[PDB]
Design a protein around this ligand. Structure first.
Ligand SMILES: O=C(O)CNC(=O)c1nc(Nc2ccc([N+](=O)[O-])cc2)ccc1O
Ligand SMILES: [Zn+2]
Length: 441
């Protein structure tokens, strides 16, 4: 059968060198006590203020509430999509980007994890330099970029509060997180983790461990790495892609800060605002009224506009409001941006209404009319399916049982009897009519 290796095994060390060499462990001895206290106190400060939340993710089309409470901290305006859920950063005091902040204690913790982020980056760079030197024996711009952590994901779980899955392949026992890869990260980027634990043939069940295995491979024995207070481990160059990792629950609670280079080419506030302004170039912008007039009705421009319409609504507005008043407990940073994004979105609703108005114009030849329909039919259809999915998710039995502050909100939403909106929430009657437009031709 399957098996795993711990420092109690003679083969454990040689197995580490020959099969998991890009995995680096740094014990609490290598971390200053002054930094140790600051980070651990920051963990409990965020826990005391209730800044850690369990997420209502969707996996394989099934609504699941994660056993691990978590929070995202990182650069202002940055996001990390994980398990189809876009987490928004609680900002930390990056250089020349001073924040109005959150509550005073919460701001200290974010600065603290920024300080921890700086230290882990330095260790990662040295580790990557040593890794490259060893390979050379047997560019430097890449090493800095692959260690340039932009966000950290904090997690907390109390095993005593959760009724746990057994590890299925190597008998590693109870799991807090199943085998997986850390996704949505820059290619070959390193991951640094700070483990904060609290207080026989096989691994110790009471001690927290991180598991490791090769992808597609349960014949190679896995590694169970015990984690104590202040232990740090690093997933170097391509370990995260070639190997899977899991978390093995101990007996006591445990915090962890996992620092990542999030891939955010389409996941920043600056990126999405620029996308919104690209869509609104097709609108006469003298005044912000309800008489939306479009500069061009070219199918290519219309298709790009309605795609951006979906991106801001579903990847940003509905993602943000599905988590409810979660960040308001932590920071007010995203309040104005989400108001601005919602304002930009409402104008695009007028654009769509303008596009539908032009389609039904009397002096528009069927040649040009069908062209517009072919350009926007896919975009409007997805907007219909996704609105149904998000509306259903906000009313699922699991969702209705959440705490009031974390209750999902299907925002934006408006009843059919609402005249403040140019278009209704349900588009099926429009979609069916538009589909029949191409059928009659
Ligand atoms: O706590 C520790 O010691 C180690 N932390 C982890 O293992 C850990 N990784 C995660 N990564 C991840 C998973 C799925 C996806 N996705 O897009 O699907 C993206 C990223 C998520 C939660 C986690 O607890
Ligand atoms: Zn992970």
């Amino acid at each position: 059968r399957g098996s795993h290796m711990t420092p109690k095994d003679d083969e454990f060390y040689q197995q580490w060198q020959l099969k998991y060499p890009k995995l680096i462990l740094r014990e609490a001895s290598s971390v200053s006590e002054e930094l140790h206290k600051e980070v651990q106190e920051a963990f409990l400060t965020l826990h005391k203020h209730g800044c850690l939340f369990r997420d209502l993710v969707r996996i394989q089309g099934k609504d699941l509430l994660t056993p691990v409470s978590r929070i995202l901290i990182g650069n202002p305006g940055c996001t990390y999509k994980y398990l189809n859920t876009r987490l928004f950063t609680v900002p930390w005091p990056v250089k020349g980007s001073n924040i109005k902040h959150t509550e005073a204690e919460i701001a200290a913790a974010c600065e603290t994890f920024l300080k921890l982020n700086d230290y882990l980056q330095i260790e990662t760079i040295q580790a990557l330099e040593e890794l490259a030197a060893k390979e050379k024996a047997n560019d430097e711009v890449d090493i800095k970029s692959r260690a340039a952590y932009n966000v950290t994901l904090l997690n907390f779980m109390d095993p005593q509060k959760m009724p746990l899955k057994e590890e299925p392949y190597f008998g590693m026992g109870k799991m807090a997180v199943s085998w997986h890869h850390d996704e949505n990260l820059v290619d070959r980027s390193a991951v640094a983790v700070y483990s904060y634990s609290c207080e026989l043939e096989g691994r110790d069940p009471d001690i927290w461990h991180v598991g490791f295995k090769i992808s597609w491979d349960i014949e190679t024995p896995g590694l169970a790495i015990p984690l104590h207070q202040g232990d740090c481990y690093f997933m170097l160059d391509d370990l995260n892609a070639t190997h899977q990792h899991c978390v093995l629950a101990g007996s006591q609670p445990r915090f962890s800060s996992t620092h990542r280079v999030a891939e955010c080419s389409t996941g920043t506030l600056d990126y999405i605002l620029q996308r919104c302004q690209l869509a609104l170039q097709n609108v006469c912008d003298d005044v912000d009224n309800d008489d939306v007039s479009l500069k061009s009705f070219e199918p290519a421009v219309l298709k790009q506009g309605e795609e951006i319409h979906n991106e801001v609504e579903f990847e940003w507005l509905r993602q943000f409001w599905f988590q409810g008043n979660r960040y308001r407990k932590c920071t007010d940073w995203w309040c104005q941006p989400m108001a601005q994004l919602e304002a930009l979105w409402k104008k695009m609703e007028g654009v769509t209404n303008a596009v539908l108005h032009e389609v039904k114009r009397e002096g528009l030849p069927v040649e040009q009319r069908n062209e517009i329909l072919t350009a926007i039919l896919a975009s409007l259809t997805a907007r219909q399916n996704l609105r149904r999915e998000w509306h259903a998710r906000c009313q699922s039995r699991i969702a209705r049982t959440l705490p009031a502050d974390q209750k999902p909100e299907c925002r934006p939403y408006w009843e059919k009897d609402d005249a403040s909106m140019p278009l209704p929430f349900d588009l099926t009657d429009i979609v069916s009519e538009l589909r029949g437009q191409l059928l009659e031709a």
